[PDB]
Amino acid sequence: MFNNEPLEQIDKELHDILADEEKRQRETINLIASENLTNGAVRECLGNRVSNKYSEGYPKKRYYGGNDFIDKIEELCQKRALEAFNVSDEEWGVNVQPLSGSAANVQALYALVGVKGKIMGMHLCSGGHLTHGFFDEKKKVSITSDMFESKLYKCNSQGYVDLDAVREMALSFKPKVIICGYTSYPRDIDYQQFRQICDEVNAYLFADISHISSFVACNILNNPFLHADVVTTTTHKILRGPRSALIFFNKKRNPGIEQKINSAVFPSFQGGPHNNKIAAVACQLKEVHSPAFKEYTQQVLLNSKALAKALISKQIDLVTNGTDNHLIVVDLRKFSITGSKLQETCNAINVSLNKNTIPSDVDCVSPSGVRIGTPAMTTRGAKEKDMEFIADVLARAIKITVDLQEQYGKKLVDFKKGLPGNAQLQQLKQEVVTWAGALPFP
């Protein structure tokens, strides 16, 4: 007693928007630093009937039965995770149930410190995440500033983590956790000096590596597993998995952390796991290990360096004047345009990027930069030589944005009136569409 007609027949309305979404993805220069494109195999997992199964609890300790095959999938995913991130199943554990990155962070944080717990993380404006304790004078914007007592450290005027300030703050505040690992941070992290500061005040070291996961796994960047008590990561950004998260915990340094973290995920926060996610994650974690994927990850970095260099060659300023990873933040102050204006201009030419604060911004109200990254376009087959074109297109967008602001004014509502029908944008869009449309697409 069910309708088994395919999606096109059963729901034509939805199926056209979805076909449109796909065409837009295929015809866009996607520079969102947090985005990627999943292969067909990962997407076969996500639509697999294994999502029909309720399996509350952990493998070999389920509430229900009929979880024999589900248990093999969850155990295969955990094994593959610890293998991908070069850790021994004796010293490190992993939970594979968190539904997304923000959930994983709130759960892991709760496990370590509990309600009223004291935490330290990077401010949102300086490249921190929302789940690192973000609040505002007006509101406790994240639950992590409300269910916990959070304090927020900043980057210096040049965009680097200011470790002297982390330490001065830690010694007066005395937190149980210090969060490092970030959302829009263009450089590698000194986990060792974080591990030193945490020892000095007796705090846990929490590394959110969601944006740089692949670099950590492939030994291209610093390894927080040498120093961290907890490592969290999403599986959907540079790692190229589905939308999910992973919480790692150091058993050796903290006996009794395994149960704390596991019980935080369930039953403290979640109910039934989504087994299609876990399947999809298992599938991707196999790829992550392969030497082919290390090639991909290296290519992401090569592309990012080349893109930084090309933008500098066109007299565009970058926060920290470069990058150690997949991401760049462009400082837009010398052109007198906001990030939101350039995001609008770039949307009109099928260039996906986001507005992003820079060190000089006191507030998140008017961000004076944009963030770009190479993982999506590296996935689609772009090499170092193609980064000049991307740098060319972004430079042209900045100029057009300056022209449009000149003609229609600095108010955003007034600015956007210039965008529709602009001859140069239609021209620039067409150049983007022709180049992006052709590229390999999973």
Ligand X SMILES: Cc1[nH]nc2c1[C@](c1cc(F)cc(-c3cccc(CCC(=O)O)c3)c1)(C(C)C)C(C#N)=C(N)O2
Note whether 97 binds ligand PLG by CB under 6 A.
Answer: no
Look up 208 and say whether it is catalytic: yes
101 is in an annotated binding site: yes
Residues 67-96 that bind ligand PLG (CB under 6 A): none
Identify whether 237 is a catalytic site residue: yes
Return the exposure string of 326-359: e unless at least 16 CB atoms fall within 10 Å of the residue's CB, then b. Answer: bbbbbbbeebebbbbbbbbbbebbbbbbbbbbbb
Decide which of a second copy, ligand PLG, ligand X, none touches 409; Cβ closer than 5 to 8 Å per partner kind.
none
211 binds ligand PLG (CB under 6 A): yes
Tokens of 246: 């992973």
Four-CA torsion 257, 259, 265, 266, nearest 10 degrees: -170
Q: Is 78 in the site for a second copy (CB under 8 A)?
A: no
Q: CB 83 → ligand X: shortest distance, Å?
A: 30
Q: Is 240 annotated as a binding residue?
A: no
Q: Give the one entry of ligand X, a second copy, ligand PLG, none that residue 24 binds, where binding means its C-beta sits below a cut-off of 5 to 8 angstroms depending on kind.
A: a second copy
- Which of 183, 223, 250, 297 contacts ligand PLG by CB under 6 A? 183
Q: Which amino acid is at 64?
A: Y
Should residue 352 be labelled a site residue for ligand PLG when binding is judged by CB under 6 A?
Answer: no
Q: Which of 62, 117, 111, 96 is nearest to 258 (CA)?
A: 111
Name which of ligand X, a second copy, ligand PLG, none residue 364 binds, using a CB cut-off of 5 to 8 Å depending on partner kind.
Answer: ligand X
Q: How far is CA 406 from the centre of its chain?
A: 35
DSSP 298: H
3-state secondary structure of 144: helix
**In whole angstroms, what is the distance from residue 291 CA to residue 227 CA?**
25
CA 366 to chain centre: 22
Q: Which of 237, 240, 371, 396 is catalytic?
A: 237
Q: Using CB under 6 A, which of the segments 108-116, 299-307, 354-362, 376-384 binds ligand X?
A: 354-362
In terms of CB distance, is 33 or 394 closer to ligand X?
33
183 binds ligand X (CB under 6 A): yes
What mask of x and - would describe binding to a second copy in positions 26 to 65, judged by CB under 8 A? --x-x-x-xxxxxxxx-xxxxxxxxxxxx--------xxx
What's the angle, vertex CA 212, arms to CA 295 and CA 271, rounded to 5? 115
Which residue is nearest to ligand X, using beta carbons? 183
Which residues are 152's β-sheet partners?
Answer: 121
Determine how many CB atoms are found less than 10 A away from the CB of residue 77: 28
Is residue 274 marked as binding?
no
CA atoms of 246 and 252, how far apart (whole Å): 19
Q: Does 6 bind ligand PLG (CB under 6 A)?
A: no
Write the DSSP symbol of residue 440.
-
After which residues does the chain have a break in its backbone, defined as C to next N over 2.5 Å?
none
Beta carbons within 8 Å of 11's beta carbon, 6+ residues apart: none
| 277 is a site residue for ligand PLG (CB under 6 A) | no
| Cβ-based nearer residue to a second copy, 222 or 304 | 304
CA count, 13 A, side-chain hemisphere, 11: 8
Residue 54 known to be catalytic: yes
Contact residue for ligand X among 304, 357, 368, 401 (CB under 6 A): 357
Is 90 part of the annotated catalytic residue set?
A: no
Residue 68 corresponds to which tokens in the numbers above? 């024999």
| Residue 25 touching a second copy (CB under 8 A) | yes
Q: Identify the H or E element spanning 62.
A: strand 61-62
Q: Is 184 in the site for ligand X (CB under 6 A)?
A: yes
According to CB under 6 A, which residues from 250 to 279 bind ligand X?
Answer: 267
- The answer to whether 234 is a known catalytic residue is yes
Residue 123 is assigned to a ligand binding site? no
Place of tokens 């930069």: 369
**Residue 123: Cβ within 10 Å count:** 19
**Which parts are annotated binding residues?**
54, 100-102, 129, 183, 211, 236, 243, 272
Interaction site with ligand X (CB under 6 A): 56, 63, 124, 127-130, 141, 183-184, 267, 354-357, 364-365, 367
Which residues are identified as catalytic? Answer: 54, 56, 208, 234, 237, 243
**Which parts are annotated binding residues for pyridoxal 5'-phosphate?**
54, 100-102, 129, 183, 211, 236, 243, 272
